[PDB]
Design an enzyme around this catalytic site. Structure first.
Site, PDB file in Angstrom:
ATOM      1  N   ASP A   1      12.479  -1.400  -9.375  1.00  0.00           N
ATOM      2  CA  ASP A   1      12.658  -0.964  -9.882  1.00  0.00           C
ATOM      3  C   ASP A   1      12.635   0.663  -9.464  1.00  0.00           C
ATOM      4  O   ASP A   1      12.550   1.369 -10.384  1.00  0.00           O
ATOM      5  CB  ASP A   1      10.521  -1.445  -9.460  1.00  0.00           C
ATOM      6  CG  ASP A   1      10.109  -2.709 -10.526  1.00  0.00           C
ATOM      7  OD1 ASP A   1      10.770  -2.968 -11.232  1.00  0.00           O
ATOM      8  OD2 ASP A   1       8.983  -2.530 -10.007  1.00  0.00           O
TER       9      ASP A   1
ATOM     10  N   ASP B   1       3.946   4.333  -2.335  1.00  0.00           N
ATOM     11  CA  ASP B   1       3.278   4.189  -3.432  1.00  0.00           C
ATOM     12  C   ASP B   1       2.345   4.168  -3.759  1.00  0.00           C
ATOM     13  O   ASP B   1       1.521   4.123  -4.717  1.00  0.00           O
ATOM     14  CB  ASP B   1       4.114   2.509  -3.197  1.00  0.00           C
ATOM     15  CG  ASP B   1       4.919   2.780  -4.155  1.00  0.00           C
ATOM     16  OD1 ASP B   1       5.559   3.982  -4.464  1.00  0.00           O
ATOM     17  OD2 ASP B   1       6.074   1.626  -4.126  1.00  0.00           O
TER      18      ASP B   1
ATOM     19  N   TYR C   1       1.617  -5.082  -2.025  1.00  0.00           N
ATOM     20  CA  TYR C   1       1.794  -4.777  -0.497  1.00  0.00           C
ATOM     21  C   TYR C   1       0.256  -5.213   0.021  1.00  0.00           C
ATOM     22  O   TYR C   1       0.463  -5.792   0.920  1.00  0.00           O
ATOM     23  CB  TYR C   1       1.583  -3.224  -0.130  1.00  0.00           C
ATOM     24  CG  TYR C   1       3.709  -2.447  -0.422  1.00  0.00           C
ATOM     25  CD1 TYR C   1       3.682  -1.316  -1.205  1.00  0.00           C
ATOM     26  CD2 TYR C   1       4.136  -3.702  -0.236  1.00  0.00           C
ATOM     27  CE1 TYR C   1       4.349  -1.125  -1.326  1.00  0.00           C
ATOM     28  CE2 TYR C   1       6.034  -2.832   0.204  1.00  0.00           C
ATOM     29  CZ  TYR C   1       5.419  -2.044  -0.594  1.00  0.00           C
ATOM     30  OH  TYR C   1       7.051  -1.707  -1.327  1.00  0.00           O
TER      31      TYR C   1
END
EC number: 1.17.4.1
Lengths: 349, 349
Positions: free
Chosen positions: A237, A84, A122
């Site tokens: 998501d 990500d 994260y």
């Protein structure tokens, strides 16, 4: 020839998704494909902040984990952060300069944004469970296993971006650059895009779901529950994101949006197959790395590899590819508890 | 000169615990030391059968355990089976021919019997969790780590038994056997007994409690709960057994029972110290073997080794020995939940 506000008054309903006239006016009263407008609305409705989730107890659980279980959890954490980090910036950089319809343009910007929230989550987790976050973040770049995946995944983006720049700067045709031959082809560029979208679809529909299994497996043991609450939000998501790329890919290969894309899609249909398979294999080899020092209750190399095959078959049928693996049932049906949302189908069907 | 019914009408209240006139009439209306009569009554009140406990679910838990957690559980299981295989027969064979008071004689027979129930419980567990029990039982004999402990522990019994046979057959003095010199000494024999009792005290008060921690650690994770219910019953018996040997040892070294034993106890007080320490060390090295392929939530080599020291200090003070390790608190206070009984103090205080 990229323009941040094209002066031609075009009918945005008749533009292709990609490579058409760059979007001038951002309007949302109409759309060629309302799926993207529906995705924007869903993603907006899902908006969350990482700090909403208390991850305090996860520090205690983590410290009490055996070294090899730490290795499992933190390796998985690092890999997610890698993916990500890439997904944070790449949809914007790679896709925006090519989009020619407003609803798709805004969906991509909304998509990328939601990824930065994932990245931030994260960080929120890492800061709370380890003493020195730098050790973790630096390993994301230097780790031999992680690095291999980063290079393959990022190359699909990088090649698309570079060919885009040539296209904007030189236009279609054969060119002379510093004494070298540069052949710009829209057909080739369209192929680079399709392949890239296939890669990203696999990234989000397969690679991340393999990771969700690892996380929710701790949650099944009643460990790292804060992390699991965040992954649940991230998974919701992700279901939107992969839905987005599934519609892009399917609309492209149908020929309804661009008849030329239909041909190109059929041409590299083998390549896309090989792409997905290579990704599934790479995640299987990742399972090997995760559990190289031992496994834990409810999850091991064998089980996770089965899940890879089960999920890979599903995702590939969705994008019209042949199934690479034997037809199997869900090896870990307990994961559907965590992969659920009343507003979108998170669990693969 | 052992007789199963000595014809002399002796006052059993004035006999020593050991090496006196062999018990003729088994009577329980009186006793020299009522502690043994109280132990008999307690042990009788505790009588249980292994089959009362359903261990069905433990098969499922076991199969789902990671290989190294299987290794932990089954290694511990095998070691317990070894110890109480020895404890099944040895108190009877080694101690009975030497006892001269009825309440002690019957306590030893009751003690040994309760151990055969423990052995039978381990069979009940093994049959239910593995496919081929023979593999397990055979490894108890051939396992290099287990074998080392068996030899040391059994030697204390074996030497006592052999010296006893010479004593019964030859009586005290220097003898000629096949051209060799055999010197039978009651003082030496008394020493062999005291040392053996020290070894058995360590076996039951330390070695087994280290094992209880390993078992109850699975139960803390809500795994192998059937096994834990049985260990709870076994632990309650073990508290009686070690209480028995603690009173034997203390009554011997006080000189109240036999003034000569007091001297002998002081003579080999270093040896007994070295015995207990060597046992504690052997259990520490066992922790190394258990967790050589990894540990699990709530228990590892470091934690278990701390427990060894904590329990060893306690047991040794009870038998009047110097503490070999630093004064520490209980590293695993959660174990006291499992080591509890309303009728006897199972947990060490």
């Amino acid at each position: 020839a990229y323009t941040t506000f094209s002066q031609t008054k075009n009918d945005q309903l008749k533009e292709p998704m990609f490579f058409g006239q760059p979007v001038n006016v951002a309007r949302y009263d109409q759309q060629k494909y309302d799926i993207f407008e529906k995705l924007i609305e869903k993603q907006l409705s899902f908006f969350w902040r990482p700090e909403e989730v208390d991850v305090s107890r996860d520090r205690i659980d983590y410290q009490a984990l055996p070294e090899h279980e730490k290795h499992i959890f933190i390796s998985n954490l690092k890999y997610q952060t890698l993916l990500d980090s890439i997904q944070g910036r790449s949809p914007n950089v790679a896709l925006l300069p090519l989009i020619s319809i407003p609803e798709l343009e805004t969906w991509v910007e909304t998509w990328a944004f939601s990824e930065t929230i994932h990245s931030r989550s994260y960080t929120h987790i890492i800061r709370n469970i380890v003493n020195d976050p730098s050790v973790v973040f630096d390993d994301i770049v230097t780790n031999e296993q992680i690095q291999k995946r980063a290079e393959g995944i990022s190359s699909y983006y990088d090649e698309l971006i570079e060919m885009t720049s040539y296209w904007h700067l030189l236009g279609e045709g054969t060119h002379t650059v510093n004494g070298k031959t540069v052949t710009v082809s829209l057909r080739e560029l369209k192929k680079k895009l399709y392949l890239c979208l296939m890669s990203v679809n696999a990234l989000e529909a397969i690679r991340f779901y393999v990771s969700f299994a690892c996380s929710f497996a701790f949650a099944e043991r009643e460990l790292m529950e804060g992390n699991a609450k965040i992954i649940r939000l991230i998974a919701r998501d992700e279901a939107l994101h992969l839905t987005g790329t599934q519609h892009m890919l399917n609309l492209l290969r149908s020929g309804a949006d661009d008849p030329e894309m239909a041909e190109i899609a059929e041409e590299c249909k083998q390549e896309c197959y090989d792409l997905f398979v290579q990704a599934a294999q790479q995640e299987k080899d990742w399972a090997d790395y995760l559990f190289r020092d031992g496994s834990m209750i409810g999850l091991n190399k064998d089980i996770l590899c089965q899940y890879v095959e089960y999920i890979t078959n599903i995702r590939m049928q969705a994008v019209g590819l042949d199934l690479p693996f034997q037809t199997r049932s869900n090896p870990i049906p307990w994961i559907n508890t965590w992969l659920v949302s009343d507003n979108v189908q998170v669990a693969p069907q």
